[PDB]
Amino acid sequence: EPFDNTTYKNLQHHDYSTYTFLDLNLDLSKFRMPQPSSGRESPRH
Amino acid sequence: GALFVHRDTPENNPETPFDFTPENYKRIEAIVKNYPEGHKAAAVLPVLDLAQRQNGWLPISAMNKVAEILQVPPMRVYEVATFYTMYNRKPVGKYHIQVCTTTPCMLRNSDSILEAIQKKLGIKVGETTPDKLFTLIEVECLGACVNAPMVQINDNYYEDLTPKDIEEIIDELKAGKIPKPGPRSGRFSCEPAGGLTSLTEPPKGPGFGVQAGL
Amino acid sequence: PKKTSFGSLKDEDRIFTNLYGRHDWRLKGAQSRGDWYKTKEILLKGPDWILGEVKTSGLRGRGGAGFPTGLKWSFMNKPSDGRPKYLVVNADEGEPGTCKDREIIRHDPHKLVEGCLVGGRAMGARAAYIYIRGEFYNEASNLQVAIREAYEAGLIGKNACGSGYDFDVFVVRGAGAYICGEETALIESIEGKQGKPRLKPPFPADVGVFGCPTTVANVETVAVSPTICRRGGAWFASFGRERNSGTKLFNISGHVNNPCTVEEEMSVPLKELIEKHAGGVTGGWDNLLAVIPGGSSTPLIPKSVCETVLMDFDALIQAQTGLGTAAVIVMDRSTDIVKAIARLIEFYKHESCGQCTPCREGVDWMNKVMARFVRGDARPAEIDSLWEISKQIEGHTICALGDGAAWPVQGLIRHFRPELEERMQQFAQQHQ
Amino acid sequence: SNLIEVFVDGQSVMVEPGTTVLQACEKVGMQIPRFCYHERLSVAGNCRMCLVEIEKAPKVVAACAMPVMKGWNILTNSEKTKKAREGVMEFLLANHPLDCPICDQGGECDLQDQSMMFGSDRSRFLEGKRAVEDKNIGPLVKTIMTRCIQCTRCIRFASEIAGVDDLGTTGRGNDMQVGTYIEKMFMSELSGNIIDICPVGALTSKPYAFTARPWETRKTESIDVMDAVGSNIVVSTRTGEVMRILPRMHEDINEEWISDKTR
Numbered sequence: 001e002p003f004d005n006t007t008y009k010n011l012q013h014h015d016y017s018t019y020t021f022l023d024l025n026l027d028l029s030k031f032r033m034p035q036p037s038s039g040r041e042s043p044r045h
Numbered sequence: 046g047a048l049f050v051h052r053d054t055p056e057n058n059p060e061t062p063f064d065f066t067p068e069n070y071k072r073i074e075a076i077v078k079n080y081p082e083g084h085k086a087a088a089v090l091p092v093l094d095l096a097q098r099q100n101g102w103l104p105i106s107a108m109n110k111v112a113e114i115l116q117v118p119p120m121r122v123y124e125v126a127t128f129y130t131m132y133n134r135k136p137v138g139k140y141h142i143q144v145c146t147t148t149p150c151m152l153r154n155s156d157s158i159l160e161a162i163q164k165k166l167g168i169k170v171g172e173t174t175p176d177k178l179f180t181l182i183e184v185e186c187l188g189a190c191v192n193a194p195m196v197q198i199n200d201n202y203y204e205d206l207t208p209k210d211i212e213e214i215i216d217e218l219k220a221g222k223i224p225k226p227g228p229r230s231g232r233f234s235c236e237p238a239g240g241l242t243s244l245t246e247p248p249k250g251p252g253f254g255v256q257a258g259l
Numbered sequence: 260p261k262k263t264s265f266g267s268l269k270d271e272d273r274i275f276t277n278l279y280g281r282h283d284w285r286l287k288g289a290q291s292r293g294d295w296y297k298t299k300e301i302l303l304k305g306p307d308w309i310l311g312e313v314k315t316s317g318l319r320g321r322g323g324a325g326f327p328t329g330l331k332w333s334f335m336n337k338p339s340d341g342r343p344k345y346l347v348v349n350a351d352e353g354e355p356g357t358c359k360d361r362e363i364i365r366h367d368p369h370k371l372v373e374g375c376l377v378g379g380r381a382m383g384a385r386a387a388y389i390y391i392r393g394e395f396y397n398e399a400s401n402l403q404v405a406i407r408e409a410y411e412a413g414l415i416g417k418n419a420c421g422s423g424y425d426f427d428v429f430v431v432r433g434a435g436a437y438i439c440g441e442e443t444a445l446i447e448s449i450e451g452k453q454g455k456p457r458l459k460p461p462f463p464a465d466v467g468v469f470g471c472p473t474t475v476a477n478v479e480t481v482a483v484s485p486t487i488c489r490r491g492g493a494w495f496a497s498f499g500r501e502r503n504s505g506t507k508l509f510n511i512s513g514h515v516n517n518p519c520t521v522e523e524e525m526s527v528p529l530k531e532l533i534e535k536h537a538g539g540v541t542g543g544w545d546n547l548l549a550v551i552p553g554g555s556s557t558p559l560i561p562k563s564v565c566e567t568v569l570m571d572f573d574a575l576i577q578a579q580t581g582l583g584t585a586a587v588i589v590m591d592r593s594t595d596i597v598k599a600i601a602r603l604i605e606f607y608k609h610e611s612c613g614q615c616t617p618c619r620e621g622v623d624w625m626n627k628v629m630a631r632f633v634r635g636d637a638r639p640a641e642i643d644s645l646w647e648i649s650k651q652i653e654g655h656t657i658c659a660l661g662d663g664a665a666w667p668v669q670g671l672i673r674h675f676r677p678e679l680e681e682r683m684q685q686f687a688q689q690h691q
Numbered sequence: 692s693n694l695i696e697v698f699v700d701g702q703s704v705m706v707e708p709g710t711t712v713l714q715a716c717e718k719v720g721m722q723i724p725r726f727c728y729h730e731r732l733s734v735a736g737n738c739r740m741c742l743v744e745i746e747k748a749p750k751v752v753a754a755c756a757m758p759v760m761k762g763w764n765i766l767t768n769s770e771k772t773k774k775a776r777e778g779v780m781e782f783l784l785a786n787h788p789l790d791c792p793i794c795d796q797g798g799e800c801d802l803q804d805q806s807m808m809f810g811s812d813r814s815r816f817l818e819g820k821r822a823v824e825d826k827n828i829g830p831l832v833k834t835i836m837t838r839c840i841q842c843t844r845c846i847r848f849a850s851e852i853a854g855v856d857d858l859g860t861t862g863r864g865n866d867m868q869v870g871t872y873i874e875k876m877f878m879s880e881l882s883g884n885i886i887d888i889c890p891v892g893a894l895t896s897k898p899y900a901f902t903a904r905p906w907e908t909r910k911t912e913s914i915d916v917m918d919a920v921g922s923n924i925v926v927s928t929r930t931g932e933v934m935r936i937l938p939r940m941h942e943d944i945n946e947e948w949i950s951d952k953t954r
């Protein structure tokens with residue numbers, strides 16, 4: 001707790017797997033607000 | 046080389062087996078919801094990279110699958126695959142070594158790092174080792190400019206390397222261990238080597254210097 | 260009295276207080292350094308008040324162009340026409356020499372997440388797509404963890420900070436391209452197409468990502484917005500000269516004793532920045548040959564000009580160069596200046612998008628010519644020809660990559676023509 | 692009305708809002724150079740051959756994609772406009788191959804004519820050129836892609852007019868190549884039209900290969916009878932022999948296209 005400025009606190013990324021980013025993106029799906037609608041399924045529709 | 050025209054081969058053809066694992070379909074489902082409805086073509090890049098993290102490279106069949114599930118024309122996924130350089134359209138080694146050789150890294154003797162790897166692995170730039178464990182290619186600036194010379198092996202940056210240091214990393218990878226990312230010089234990050242010259246004071250706590258109105 | 264000498268910034272004025280990552284970077288470690296403080300109060304002040312603080316603070320774009328940030332963000336302050344509105348944070352740090360944006364998303368991600376909210380509310384945006392370069396996988400994972408904390412803490416999402424404002428932060432990873440740092444080419448990547456820039460008009464404020472209004476902003480130019488609003492725009496205008504105010508992150512690299520990323524006040528003398536923070540030039544300040552002040556797209560300046568030039572937008576423009584991303588690349592006498600600039604042209608050849616003729620066919624033309632200048636396999640009459648070729652590329656292209664490839668050549672010819680000619684005289688006699 | 696006033700070399704002209712600088716010059720009989728712009732395709736703005744100076748502006752504007760603002764004086768023949776056309780034409784011809792004698796587009800080539808009308812008269816290019824490998828896209832269109840100038844007219848036409856998303860650009864930079872990437876045939880009822888809209892000899896007719904030259908043909912304006920649409924055509928003949936069929940513009944029937952059977 002005492003002010004310490006001699007250690008690297010960003011060590012969590014030493015054990016990130018290949019799917020870490022996509023796993024986090026999957027967890028941030030129930031918080032997202034509903035997307036806007038263009039009105040068509042795609043520009044080719 | 047890396048030609049930008051596809052020719053069918055027994056090991057790379059539209060009938061080559063590829064399909065997303067059941068878990069990846071869930072990840073793809075979350076990817077598509079990050080974009081407005083009716084603009085599902087915006088998921089080509091993240092989905093293409095996902096198809097590469099499962100396989101390790103993008104066969105012509107993998108590109109067709111990405112087109113199939115996003116309802117995008119196949120030619121519009123070939124454009125993405127060939128434009129962005131992180132997509133591997135041929136098999137690579139288990140550890141894709143990428144040496145930065147742009148001027149900031151060149152000025153700090155990045156050629157010595159490249160020389161050390163070739164002698165150590167017994168390969169040349171752009172070649173895969175006989176055991177299919179290492180692929181070596183030069184790349185442009187990777188961001189870790191102040192920590193030059195540096196290399197990227199898969200998804201990790203190894204920085205402040207010297208000809209001795211990089212060879213240690215290859216030995217650790219050729220045994221099975223997981224080398225620790227970051228600089229190998231004594232420092233931890235972009236901080237100056239000879240001790241900090243700034244931010245050497247307890248940072249001010251919440252609500253310091255706030256304006257009167259706020 | 261307005262200050263005449265600038266620099267010697269104090270640790271109480273540095274916005275990025277965890278630049279070196281020595282402290283905790285999670286939500287608990289950020290709320291102790293002033294992040295997410297009175298965010299709801301700032302949001303309820305409205306967009307005009309937020310844009311008023313940024314406008315009066317003198318903040319200018321930190322991505323390299325340097326446009327006034329307050330005026331640019333104001334183009335989005337217009338009534339809705341039925342389309343969504345988005346903020347796109349450009350984290351596609353790919354300018355050779357620049358590492359500042361990497362140290363913000365890896366050690367101060369919450370200072371960026373809050374900036375998206377503060378900047379987005381000022382623009383009336385409903386989401387903030389953060390385009391992070393593909394190679395920054397570990398930094399993009401930290402930013403995803405920080406965003407998850409903000410959602411769980413109620414700081415973003417629905418009813419952000421308890422302010423009644425809906426906001427989302429999305430992180431989209433690039434697939435590897437320097438051109439995807441350009442504002443219009445970054446939009447095309449988010450839309451799933453090739454990273455080929457667009458013509459303007461239409462500007463992103465009118466037609467942008469998904470065809471909706473958009474404002475592309477740099478990581479640093481968005482991460483300082485919350486601190487400007489909290490401490491006011493008057494405080495941010497205290498530093499630097501007139502129209503060059505603020506604090507800037509500097510990446511000193513190349514032939515220096517202690518390459519580092521350090522925050523410093525704008526208008527700090529270049530000779531003071533290199534010696535105070537980076538341990539001086541290798542072999543002493545008298546061993547300096549040239550410095551590229553603003554990355555790689557900015558022309559190099561020789562030692563005879565670095566002894567007095569200031570590190571701000573207007574001071575460097577007066578010296579026939581630019582501030583760019585404030586990435587200082589130092590070269591000493593041992594350096595081969597022609598081979599060091601030729602490799603930069605080779606970088607632009609590889610990173611050219613190939614869309615438009617002058618840079619598709621001209622950047623690869625300059626690369627061939629510069630390749631022979633390295634060996635001296637040319638004649639002096641080609642130096643003037645290379646100048647005209649660069650002037651034909653510059654200003655005739657869709658994006659500013661073409662200009663960024665011409666400027667390095669012009670600086671070399673402007674300040675090192677005797678080196679080129681001498682290299683040619685040596686080649687002739689040797690092959691005789 | 693809502694018409695706004697712009698000047699083309701000092702001559703006033705009233706144009707509707709949304710009009711482009713290139714279209715404003717048409718109203719006064721002036722035709723801006725072009726390789727990528729086609730009046731019936733999407734605006735690309737990537738050949739940079741239409742750059743035109745705007746008075747009191749330091750930067751040249753893409754005349755094909757720049758909407759005209761009120762009170763603009765478009766300078767179509769200034770030194771800046773003419774020096775922009777020489778540089779762009781010089782970059783187009785840097786890697787172009789010396790194929791004119793053996794190229795079916797010789798004599799009716801926009802790159803030849805705009806090189807002799809708006810470009811320089813010599814080259815200062817002292818390097819080796821690029822060479823691209825040819826591609827097979829059917830029995831009708833012969834491809835020699837070393838001559839391609841990356842104008843993307845075939846890409847836009849195939850996607851917009853023909854509704855076939857088979858063509859595209861692979862790679863990036865100087866090595867950017869137009870093609871189908873995979874071995875595929877662009878067999879469409881409107882496939883022959885990519886021959887015409889290709890300003891260079893990169894796309895040419897295979898049946899017509901090497902048989903004639905443009906100057907020696909006689910043009911007979913006739914009607915197509917392969918269907919009931921009545922497409923207007925030009926029957927090119929030489930010494931009493933039919934050589935090729937070409938579209939003849941008719942806004943109300945067939946635009947400037949014809950089907951493969953007609954062609």
Ligand SMILES: Cc1cc2nc3c(=O)[nH]c(=O)nc-3n(C[C@H](O)[C@H](O)[C@H](O)COP(=O)(O)O)c2cc1C
Pocket residue numbers: 319320321322323324325326328331349350351352353354437438439440441442443475476477478480658659660663
């Ligand atoms: C070739 C090229 C690459 C660029 N790369 C970046 C980048 O990596 N990060 C960034 O913030 N701006 C970059 N820019 C500048 C952007 O186009 C744009 O000016 C900036 O992102 C807008 O944000 P700002 O107001 O902070 O300047 C680049 C421009 C060009 C022409």
Ligand code: SF4
Pocket residue numbers: 438455456610611612613614615616618619656657658659660661
């Ligand atoms: S200048 Fe180069 S990178 Fe920029 S749009 Fe034109 S071709 Fe693409």
Ligand code: SF4
Pocket residue numbers: 787788789790791794795796797798800801802803838890891892893
């Ligand atoms: S396309 Fe035109 S310039 Fe090129 S070889 Fe054919 S006729 Fe000559």
Ligand code: SF4
Pocket residue numbers: 838839840841842843844845846869888889890891893894
């Ligand atoms: S093949 Fe012809 S039409 Fe297609 S891009 Fe090349 S020059 Fe243009």
Ligand code: FES
Pocket residue numbers: 145146147148149150151185186187188189190191193195355356357
């Ligand atoms: S030049 Fe190698 S990290 Fe920037």
Ligand code: FES
Pocket residue numbers: 724725726727728735736737738739740741742753754755756
């Ligand atoms: S005709 Fe305008 S850029 Fe091609």
Ligand SMILES: [K+]
Pocket residue numbers: 796885886887888889890891892893894895
């Ligand atoms: K043609």
